[PDB]
């Protein structure tokens, strides 16, 4: 096969290096049992205004969204740093949840590298973003016959907004060169305006609830993990391991080295993961490839 011919002459014929088949596989996830509070964040009765968005830390969770398939239907679900299909075989490190209310047609501005009033004066996403943006229509809950005026957005500012920034200052905006001195005069405007929501408005003006999740995937110890069952650790043989979403193939062994409290796994000169720390047991293990040594066929 290597020579790509059916006739071989004399020679040494150094063929491909031999390999060992990893007949088994293991999965190792931390001890998390209680489900994540999806009801608290998604099914909240009230949602904060867009300019003063509310940030909530999430930890010690089992990120199983299968319970959401009967509750809510999402009109927009876009993930950037991670494939949506591979969202069940991963452990997340430092997830955060942000939520607010915007108009029907300004959901498109909740994305990196976008412009508009929302993306300039209210809420800006970083250029390098890893996470998902979820939005769903909420016309039934956030609208009233008399007009819902509880939500406000900013209309004027002296400059753009840096990523993941907030500004709740209500100082009078000056449009011209004449000083305003607090008085709402000709060139003086109130920086934040009000939203008008009616049940009979067009679909582009119905209120939309937005939830944005940002996380780091591999670096640092993880706390939010998906629904994968953990198996017993197997040592000193080739196995298709899965340590908090890092899938590879190698032989595990005891390690003399000890990690710092804020470190999870280490890398060698080749920048590959040679040592990892088990999540269930605070132990150090080393990973080595299963193939080592050359073979040649004399004939």
């Amino acid at each position: 096969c290597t020579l790509k011919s059916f006739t071989v002459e004399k020679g040494i014929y150094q063929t491909s290096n031999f390999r060992v088949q990893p007949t088994e596989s293991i999965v190792r996830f931390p001890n998390i049992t209680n489900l994540c509070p999806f009801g608290e964040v998604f099914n909240a009765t009230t949602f904060a205004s867009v300019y003063a968005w509310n940030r909530k830390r999430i930890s010690n969770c089992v990120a199983d969204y299968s319970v959401l398939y009967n509750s809510t239907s999402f009109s927009t679900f876009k993930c950037y740093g991670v494939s949506p299909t591979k969202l069940n075989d991963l452990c997340f490190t430092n997830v955060y949840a942000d939520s607010f209310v915007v108009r029907g047609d300004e959901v498109r501005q909740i994305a990196p590298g976008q412009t508009g009033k929302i993306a300039d004066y209210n809420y800006k996403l970083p250029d390098d973003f890893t996470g998902c943006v979820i939005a769903w229509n909420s016309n039934n809950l956030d609208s009233k016959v008399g007009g819902n005026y509880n939500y406000l957005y900013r209309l004027f500012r002296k400059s753009n907004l840096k990523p993941f920034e907030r500004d709740i200052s209500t100082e009078i905006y000056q449009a011209g060169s004449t000083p305003c001195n607090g008085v709402e005069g000709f060139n003086c405007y109130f920086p934040l305006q009000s939203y008008g929501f009616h049940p009979t408005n067009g679909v582009g003006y119905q209120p939309y609830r937005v939830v944005v999740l940002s996380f780091e995937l591999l670096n640092a110890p993880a706390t939010v993990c998906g629904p994968k069952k953990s198996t017993n650790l197997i040592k000193n043989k080739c196995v298709n391991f899965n340590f908090n979403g890092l899938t590879g193939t190698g032989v595990l062994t005891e390690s003399n080295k000890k990690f710092l409290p804020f470190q999870q796994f280490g890398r060698d000169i080749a920048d590959t993961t040679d040592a990892v720390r088990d999540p269930q047991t605070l132990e150090i293990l080393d990973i080595t490839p299963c193939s080592f040594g050359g073979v040649s066929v004399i004939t």
Binding site: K162, I168, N219
Partner: protein, 278 residues
């Protein structure tokens, strides 16, 4: 409630060079016996560093001004009586915007983000009762409270307040405000030098990453003054304290990782031609 303090001597400050300070871990990945080259915000070697101090006598002074905050600063405080308490960060510090406050009263460190109304001279008092004990009264850093979106208070503890001939702490900190996060790096190395900055090499480890999400341009420092019986001017004597401030710049370093997995040496790529060829 806070009142500006009087009777302080006037003199321009001095300058000092931080030899090999300001090196911190770049990420949270273990490494060993490797020469990793990385670029990030760093404190250049042999950079100008202002030297403030708080001391009693006509040389009594405090020197807690509004230093500028340029894309991350390096802070290193050395003392023996826990005079240094914390800092305040913000743009204008006049209740028009939000500001971050970090301080431990005496028993628990408090972190808040709010529209605080500070005054010109923020400080905390300490009272030395002679019959028996330092009470640490007079918590008058700010003047009003507001929405206070962020909030965090640690578990109660206790600490000594007198600790009085040479400095013994040399507590270093590094602050960075990038993409809405407030990263803090800290290190604690005991020393015995008398009245200067001890040259050496120290690697700083990450402490906390607060999603504050505000805009920071200026900052101050909170000092604790103790008065017992010495006569605005009620004998606010300070025992002994000094701190040094440096400004981070975008540089390239050649960090060295030890066998254990610790950073022990660094090389600047812009210090001088020899370091450049290194």
């Amino acid at each position: 409630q806070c009142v500006n303090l009087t009777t302080r001597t006037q003199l321009p400050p001095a300058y000092t060079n931080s030899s090999t300070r300001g090196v911190y871990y770049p990420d949270k990945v273990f490494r060993s016996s490797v020469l990793h080259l990385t670029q990030d915000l760093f404190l250049p070697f042999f950079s100008n560093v202002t030297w403030f101090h708080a001391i009693h006598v006509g040389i009594k002074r405090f020197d807690n001004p509004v230093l500028p905050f340029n894309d991350g600063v390096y802070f290193a405080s050395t003392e023996k009586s826990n005079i240094i308490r914390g800092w305040i960060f913000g743009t204008t510090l006049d209740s028009k915007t939000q500001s971050l406050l970090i301080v431990n009263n005496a028993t628990n460190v408090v972190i808040k983000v709010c529209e605080f109304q500070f005054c010109n001279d923020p400080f905390l008092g300490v009272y030395y009762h002679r019959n028996n004990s330092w009470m640490e009264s007079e918590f008058r850093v700010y003047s009003s409270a507001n929405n206070c979106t962020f909030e965090y208070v640690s578990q109660p503890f206790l600490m000594d307040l007198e600790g009085k001939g040479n400095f013994k702490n040399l507590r270093e900190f590094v602050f960075k405000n990038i993409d809405g996060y407030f990263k803090i790096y800290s290190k604690h190395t005991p020393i015995n030098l008398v009245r200067d900055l001890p040259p050496g090499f120290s690697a700083l480890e990450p402490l906390v990453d607060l999603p504050i999400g505000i805009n920071i341009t200026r900052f101050q420092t909170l000092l604790a003054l103790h008065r017992s019986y010495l006569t605005s001017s009620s004998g606010w004597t300070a025992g002994a304290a000094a701190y040094y401030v440096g400004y981070l710049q975008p540089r390239t370093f050649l960090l060295k990782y030890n066998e254990n997995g610790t950073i022990t040496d660094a090389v600047d790529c812009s210090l001088d031609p020899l370091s450049e060829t290194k």
